[PDB]
Amino acid sequence: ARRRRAEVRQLQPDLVYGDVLVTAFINKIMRDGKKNLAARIFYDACKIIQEKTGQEPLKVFKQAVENVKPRMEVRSRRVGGANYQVPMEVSPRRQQSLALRWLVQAANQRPERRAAVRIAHELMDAAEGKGGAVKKKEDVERMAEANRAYAHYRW
Amino acid sequence: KEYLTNERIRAKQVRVVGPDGKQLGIMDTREALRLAQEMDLDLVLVGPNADPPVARIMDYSKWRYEQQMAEKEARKTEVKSIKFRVKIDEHDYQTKLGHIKRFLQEGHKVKVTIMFRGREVAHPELGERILNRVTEDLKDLAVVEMKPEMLGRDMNMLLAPVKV
Amino acid sequence: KRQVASGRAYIHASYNNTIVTITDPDGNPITWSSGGVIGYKGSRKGTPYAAQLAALDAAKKAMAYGMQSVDVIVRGTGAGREQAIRALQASGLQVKSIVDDTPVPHNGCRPKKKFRKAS
Amino acid sequence: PSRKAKVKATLGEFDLRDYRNVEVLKRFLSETGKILPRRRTGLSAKEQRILAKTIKRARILGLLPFTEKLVRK
RNA sequence: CGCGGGGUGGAGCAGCCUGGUAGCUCGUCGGGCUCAUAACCCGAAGGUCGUCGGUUCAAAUCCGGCCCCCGCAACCA
RNA sequence: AGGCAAGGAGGUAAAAAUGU
RNA sequence: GUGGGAGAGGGUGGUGGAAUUCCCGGAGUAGCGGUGAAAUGCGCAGAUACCGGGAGGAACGCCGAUGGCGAAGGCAGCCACCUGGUCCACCCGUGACGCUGAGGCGCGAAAGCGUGGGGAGCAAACCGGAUUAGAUACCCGGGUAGUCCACGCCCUAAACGAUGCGCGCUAGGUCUCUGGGUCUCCUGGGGGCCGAAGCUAACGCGUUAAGCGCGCCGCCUGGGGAGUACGGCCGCAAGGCUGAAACUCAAAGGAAUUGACGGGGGCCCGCACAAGCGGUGGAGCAUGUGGUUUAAUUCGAAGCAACGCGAAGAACCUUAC
Ligand SMILES: [Mg+2]
Ligand SMILES: [Mg+2]
Ligand SMILES: [Mg+2]
Ligand SMILES: [Mg+2]
Ligand SMILES: [Mg+2]
Ligand SMILES: [Mg+2]
Ligand SMILES: [Mg+2]
Ligand SMILES: [Mg+2]
Ligand SMILES: [Mg+2]
Ligand SMILES: [Mg+2]
Ligand SMILES: [Mg+2]
Ligand SMILES: [Mg+2]
Ligand SMILES: [Mg+2]
Ligand SMILES: [Mg+2]
Ligand SMILES: [Mg+2]
Ligand SMILES: [Mg+2]
Ligand SMILES: [Mg+2]
Ligand SMILES: [Mg+2]
Ligand SMILES: [Mg+2]
């Protein structure tokens, strides 16, 4: 953490397509190291997506991710005893990760029944431009824009 | 501190208490809302978890503001000490007296201490002579709650304003 | 309401706020904008972005008087003086020049201890 | 670190004390109505001081500017 | 005897006043922090509003008695 | 366009009592 | 003496702009001010910001220096006048007229006080606001005295180079200011820095000595007690100058060194924080402890580094109670 820029792990991409993003999403979904459960979940979600909005869910997923991707957000730095929501950029990979996380959160905030289903719905919402994850992203952006005042307190 | 304003109510059928305190009954939510809109002042739910959702039909924001103002006024009232010594400089004494008077005018208590060492000979006597004199000087502003009581190494008084 | 198209802009910059005054070529100020003009009450009131916003607002107001031919006079040292200038440059206004009229005493009367302690 | 010109050297021989010779003293002010330093002028210390005095005198008359506002910065 | 005003969790204070809506600080308990104590932060507990009672759909609130506290007018003291 | 340097900014460097 | 120089040296009489503040005039609108955040504050009677003019009073930006000057306090716009000191060249006059200095007399910042004037800013006290446990503080808003003048006093100071003055001596180098020269280098007088010898407790000083001397005057002889008391003198007062002792302690001290330390600096590091995931604290229960009971609840372990620890196996045993 101190010395080097700390390398970002390259994964085996998806075995069903050839997508690292997909793999990452699956991992995020996966709690407890139950991948061959969350992988199954992911594919169920994909199938559901296909059933509804009849595009290859991979592309849909990508679109959703793009929609949630934030570009400026807020960190927290204390200055003169006051704590500031410091509005700075989000780095590409990091931003992507954040988006993924948000999607997962939304899936588990949703009141609908089953694992795949919720995720699928969330993805569809993201694609549309609505839902929970997208809303969160928007809020984050606003927090940057409500507090664009402090910008100059860059890291 | 903070209640559900006009449309923030899904609490079904409401206890229609105006800003006046008058009961219009157990109206719908919607009916009550309409009434509020017409009357200009919001159906604020001061007891949603009650025998009818206590729909107090005042402007919520306005009410809040009023409360805030009241609170602010309440602050501005407090205890102000003037600690003499046994040996007194007369100018100093006068200044202290003036300060006390000012405090009383403002609305603020004046706890009037002395500082005693040991030497407790005519120390208490001296304190009495001081504090009582001070009281005599500003009876118009404050009258004494606590007389010049011995604190062992102080002599405490409390001059409390005449009217509130 | 009475118009001009040409004149000036005094950027008064304090640390506590940066205010942009927009005047004619005489010295009759038509259109001013402050920190509290852009809501920002308190600290932010004087921060760069706030200053910039104020400047932008002022520019917009001026444009409601056909005003393009604006000279810009930076008065005083403040955080937003450069940002304000930048905003003005961006805006879409005919900036004549970026003249700097800092009000510096030729050894005037003793300043407040604070701005002092300068010796 | 400062090597571009010397206002002494860019100039020819003249009377410093001549204050009414105002066109020529204008070189020894900056773009602002300010005196150029020993380090920018490059006169003798004595010489520099004399020049400064002359400038002040000129300003007092009204021939030279007392102050300016820095342009386009 | 008169008149005035007061009475709220353990202590000081808001509310009455506008009939529905009990806060604030100090303390008490417990925890956190800390090496440790103070301070600090977090919770928790704790008031039926002197009372008899009335109101009223409902009162700390409106009314009175009685209890008091407070100042003054007041004789023996 | 980059190289630094000298200057001028302005931002940041919060607070936080004690001891067998 | 003659000739020449530098200079914020001192005084007296003027003036010049920037700035601020205050008012008149405009033009214009919802805040400005302020801060680590804020709050009092001012503002719709219209501020703040901006232009124009006026009224002031103070203080002199840039030059500006590490610079110059004075004996020291000190001294900065510019000009004029009055004038002090000083340096140099010539070596011309004078011939030992010199050096110091108890006392004396004079100066002497800042504050202070007296009297009169003025008063824009700042600003003790003081009134506010915050901050805080408290805030008589640091922070902010005002605000009187005072800063400014004249005249009088007062005379202290880290009045410091913490280094009395004079002269002679004893390597240089460097940068500077200033004067003369036959001027890429000489020779005087200042101001700094680095170093020969030497000194010094080291630090450092080191031709501007704290080196070698000589002259003289001031003062010291442990720290507190104490610049106090007492007396005396001075002062309108505030105070100052002069200046003890009793008692007390066996130290007070300086300079360095080694560390440790710091809400000092820089360079670094650790799951130290951040980023992320998952927990404990909430619930029950499992334990270990603290505490409290008890006939005994055996003892040990104490912040990290005690607390699912000695116990890797308490029904009796173990077991110490
Ligand atoms: Mg001569
Ligand atoms: Mg006006
Ligand atoms: Mg000298
Ligand atoms: Mg001769
Ligand atoms: Mg002599
Ligand atoms: Mg003498
Ligand atoms: Mg007087
Ligand atoms: Mg002030
Ligand atoms: Mg306070
Ligand atoms: Mg105070
Ligand atoms: Mg102040
Ligand atoms: Mg005076
Ligand atoms: Mg001395
Ligand atoms: Mg020399
Ligand atoms: Mg040396
Ligand atoms: Mg010695
Ligand atoms: Mg003394
Ligand atoms: Mg030492
Ligand atoms: Mg973390």
Residue numbers in the entry:
A (entry chain G): 2 to 156
B (entry chain X): 3 to 78, 83 to 170
C (entry chain K): 11 to 129
D (entry chain R): 16 to 88
Give the authors' words.
IF3 is a two-domain protein that plays a particularly important role in the fidelity of selection of tRNAfMet and correct start codon. Here, we present 11 structures of Thermus thermophilus 30S PIC at resolutions as high as 3.6 Å, representing distinct steps during initiation.
In PIC-4, the last state represented by these PICs, the fMet-tRNAfMet is completely accommodated in the P site in a closed 30S conformation, and the CTD is moved to position 2. The ASL in PIC-4 is further tilted 12° toward the body compared to PIC-3 and hence would clash with the CTD in either position 1 or position 1′, which explains the need for a distinct position 2. In the structure with a second tRNA-accommodated CTD location (PIC-4), the CTD is observed far away from P site with minimal overlap with either position 1 or 1′. In this position, it can no longer contact IF1. This position of CTD is henceforth termed as position 2. In PIC-4, the CTD is moved further away from ASL to position 2, and the two domains of IF3 are furthest apart in this conformation.
